[model samples]
Target chain A: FLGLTLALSKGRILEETMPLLRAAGVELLEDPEASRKLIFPTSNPNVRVLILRASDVPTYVEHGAADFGVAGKDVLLEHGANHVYELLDLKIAQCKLMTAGVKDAPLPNRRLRIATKYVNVARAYFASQGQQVDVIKLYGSMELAPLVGLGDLIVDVVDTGNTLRANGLEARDHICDVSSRLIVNQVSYKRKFALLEPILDSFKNSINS
Target chain B: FLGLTLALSKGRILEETMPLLRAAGVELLEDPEASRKLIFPTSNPNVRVLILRASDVPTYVEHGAADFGVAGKDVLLEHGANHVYELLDLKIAQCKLMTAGVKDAPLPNRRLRIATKYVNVARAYFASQGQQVDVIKLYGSMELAPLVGLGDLIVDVVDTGNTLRANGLEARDHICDVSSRLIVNQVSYKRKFALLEPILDSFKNSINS
Candidate 1:
């Protein structure tokens, strides 16, 4: 049994990642606190688990710090920094990355002030749409930006629409359907193929079967 | 009376910030989610509370998007990317930056791998201390890096020491004490002197009174 550390962000996506792993025959282990010994064991090794942040998964896999990671497509697109392979589209944690604002918000001008955590994703989307907007980077609570008049629009992941509705905002346009992907290191694919192949096969089988 | 948008992160800091603001006679007129208004028109007509991420507080104030903000000093020192005045030490949200690892872990040779989110702060601290350490930048869950054999030590913010202690790690040395501070835009200090001075006076008076 290969030990798997699922680096997950706290919220809905974490709930989605667990069942998928269990279905693939991987046992989820818990280390409630931040521990290195359980995370990076040298002796009597069992596949250890290290629960980590979702955004850092790509970096962890790319640097071989983690053999594999589960993360959102949005984070992958934003960083474009990791060299990991996107193995499976888990179709869970489904949401739309969209431009949202108040119903009567102003239309774009020479440079519209848009805020989002996914700066790169937002930038690429606006550029593709042939729109020039100033991206105001905010790490969280993006809906607040439009509410405060800090931005003309906000590009963020919308799920239940409650957050937007509660804040008197509406989706202007959809960018993409966001979901978590199981990603793996290029080197791990080679060195641990014998160990990893069945794992991938089991995962694929679970998704298909 | 000023209608200010205060950027708040989720946690103990929020609780601490409320009392400080109340003490200073600054009323949080509109809640970010409830009011559906991010920038409420202040009674004074100029003051606005822009609830933003602790990390992006500097960005908000630097760009003149928000006249004032409450932020962690660690982020301020780490980014050092903005020009804002540290108006008052809120004195809550107290913590320290620590370099920590397993008790017996051999320290890095010339090229030491140190994990941290405070890359800028870590590099500066190590350089000033004449310690040659390579920083591994992680957004969050940095304590996991050293725990998983990804690095030799982690330079992280330790408020209660509970996180590190629970993780089978110990602090090796202290880097700096992290505290929250009220930051103001340099331009706002001059232009909004009448609106700003009273607010600062209230804070100063509250602390003493």
Candidate 2:
């Protein structure tokens, strides 16, 4: 046992990663979705799993609390995963980060206020277009901001655009296509390669096939 | 009708604030806990509601997106709600912010790394004691940090101390007691007092009784 810990987030990331994890002989003994527990044991004794918020995955991995983690590209970009090595494009939990606003509502002539959890990503995207907008950072419910006059628009992940449509909003601009990526601590890659290599190869073969 | 929008967070704060809201002649048309809708119409036509994250209630109220909001003392302190006036102590959702770690664990020789969502509060508390500590910001699951070596300790709200006991951790030091407060935007207090005063009086009466 090399004492490997891998961090993961719930929902689509965990669901899609299950097959890849199984292929790598690391099936979780219990359902993470149903449990309140943060850490879970897996079939592979050497490797354990830590369930965390998508935004926290990079933090745990970067600090070596988790040797590796599967995180959304959007999260990695927002959280700044430079300290970790991007090991693989897991090609799961696909979505697009985009700008959204009330449908058919003309943007105000004044500078825009964008509401989002992804403040860093939103600012950079607007700056790239030569628009310097004020970003109103919200922890959740970015879709609510525009309708209530809190902000002119919102930046968030759009999986189907259904949430937006239901909320009387529309996706305005594509920021980036997001998918889960396998990220690893730089030190762990070298020290734990023996424990990590076989599982990494299996994941690669399964993704390719 | 004043066209007033009130901000609130779901869970304990919402549960505790309902009686005061009803006394003020405001009641929601649907159960916010059961619905996904961010905006809700109320029995009082003049007063609608925006259900948001507890941390976001302060932001919405401070920005004039909401005329007023109910927020926890801990949230207001961490979020810095200076632009908004803390009008009334609704005195609900009571808890304490405390340092917690593995039970009976010996203090490390080096500077402690504290993991918490309340990074600002944690820094100020440690600095007050003349201790310089490293704070690792986490969005959720603070109890898991100490067990996994993510941090030497964590600063988080303890409602019953049951969560810590269950996780094999214990509260080490109390930072401060917390409770809900009715916060009104300074500008809104002046411009919308006619619309707000009656409800404010009702809340005060209910709290006193």
Candidate 3:
């Protein structure tokens, strides 16, 4: 029987989380990036991993398909965590949710158009600033929007600002800082606390250690 | 001056559409798959291309950033087309939108759970059949959902049966057949008809020929 199932997405989060999971005596047997397989067996017999899209992490955990998951703050805010409890901050996959636009371009005095994948976050963020803007939803390549005249600005997670610079865009405003956080299904937290505690404790301590 | 701007996403649609575009005297200077550039210059001096996410193609065209775009029927159905006109059926990237679930697994008689990116399509489809289903939205990895017990079924576009078979899932119901279509900005179609006529003619004739 699987004692715990953790949903994770590849890239920075997986690379960083592996070390913490290792310190906690949990390790994936195979490389997820190189494999087409979704489910992976871990060194700890009771633990297993499910590789998924970063945006899908919360959905999996919320549905209890995954007992817990690691998701970015941006994803949680945009998607809205319903039945999941945010437990610990992994401090990995750090970035900032910011508004970007073509470098040196001035916005019109009129209501601006914003393109983004984070519809809810963008809407709420601009509203908080007392600005009413039209949000154009795009799945990816937010940096490309302003360059092509699709929108006046874009809201996206900016890390090194390299992608923005490469696209001739510059960060305009910071909405919030984002990092991967450990989230657990409300139901799973109660039933699997015994199985999750050691790993959770190790993760909590490993954040800075 | 660029007379027309065409938006397209890389992958099956791009690969398939290139032949038609070539027949229409529009050819990309560089391979979009190899380049990180979002926009590409083409042989036709008047026409430029914007490489966007399949889901973003319509958005760009609808906003008049691009005169026209090629997108999958599945995407258009899921994200509703507004301020855009579906003109020609490219008949490329053909697939069927279907419901999939664990092979031979019985479903609950109560409300069925479906995980999919095509939330609008899934909901309307089930409702059309008078079947009540609770769709759990997921950005990707629909095949993995049923295996992990995330949902009773998944609604997704199925091309080759390989992905489903590999995941131990089987097609349960066919929602609709999907294919790439050429969509135009209503405003662009009216204003740029002079520049659009030749290419549109070529695409229409090249569909079957």
Candidate 4:
């Protein structure tokens, strides 16, 4: 029986996660980026990898479809952390959850209009600041919202502030610092602790070294 | 004064829409695909384009941020068409909304699990068939869901049927044939008819010709 299925997303998450998995002695035999296969065989026969969207990582782990996953803190925040146990912070793919808009633009209205894919995160952040705002849900290219009057501002992840500057926008507030986290299914953690503990400990030790 | 702002998304819709807009004497000054600008100017000074995500077309038009938009029938169905006037069927970017799963996979349980980005469409489609299935929301790559045990089936737009086949899945049911439609905000249809009439008529005629 496959002892574990680790869910991971492509791009930066996968790029950053490769080393940690190597340190844990679980290297993917096939490159997920180059292959169409979703399930990749790892060096450890007992473990396989499930390539997923960053946002879907938590969902798959929560549903027990994936025994564990590596997801960003921003994704974890938006997906909510109740269902999965945050086992370790790998501190990879670092960025910030931020509010951004056209530089020095006046507020369109007293009740602000914000565009974001992170509706819950934006809502909670604005609510914490004691402001009532209308959050417009957008899938991608949040930087374009303010450029075309789709919304007055946008909440999105910012790494180097280059995408925002390219779109004539500026980061207004830093909601939180974000990094990749190692998350495990609640049930999987208990049932598969014997199989999972070494990998977790390896990641923890690898991070410090 | 700003004239009609027509919202559109990239990919097939944008590719197919260009010729129609050109036929209507509204050639874009810049290629939206090549440019980073969210708002593109057209040969017609009075009209401009707002590039947005396919799913966001309805929301922007509904909020009056965009006077009108070109969106797929599937998007309209999921977003609901009540807030917009389904002015014309442009008949571009054709595809099918379908239910797909493993070729001969057995149902793990009585309650069918469906994974899809089209949550409302899947829910309504299943309800209409008198089958109450659990619809799990996914962002993209619906084919991977069933393969990873995330869901037993997936509801998604099938184009060419190649992606499903590549993933070792088959379409089980065709929900509907999907095509791009010109949607005008209810208020925009009423307020900007004088400016919008020619473009609407040209599209109607172009579809036939």
* Number of the top lDDT candidate: 2
What is the TM-score of chain A, computed separately for every candidate?
Answer: 0.87, 0.97, 0.97, 0.98
Deviating ranges (above 4 Å) for candidate 2: none
Candidate 1 lDDT by residue in tens digits, A43-156:
224344455676787878877777877788888888674588888887778888999999776685478778888888888899999976688777787887765567788899
Task: Give the candidates in order of DockQ, highest first.
Answer: 3, 2, 4, 1
The weakest ten consecutive residues by lDDT in model 1 chain A span A37-46
Rank list by lDDT: 2, 3, 4, 1
Residues B68-100, model 2: lDDT tens digits: 999999999999977899999987899999999
lDDT of 1: 0.73
Worst 10 residues of 3 chain B by lDDT: B1-10
The i-RMS of every model, in angstroms, reads 2.5, 0.7, 0.9, 1.4
What is the model-wide C-alpha lDDT for candidate 4? Answer: 0.91
Of candidate 4 chain A, the 10-residue stretch with the lowest lDDT total is A144-153
Indicate the residue-level lDDT of A196 in model 4: 98
Q: Is candidate 1 or candidate 4 better by TM-score?
A: 4
Q: Who is ahead in lDDT, 2 or 3?
A: 2
Q: What is the lDDT of residue B207 in candidate 3?
A: 85
Interface RMSD of 2: 0.7
Task: Kindly report the docking quality category of candidate 3.
Answer: high
Please give me the DockQ of candidate 2 compared with the native complex. 0.87
lDDT of 3 by residue, B45-144 (tens): 8989998888888888889999999999999998788779999999999999999999999989899888899989999999998987898988888999
Error of 3 at A195 (Å): 0.5
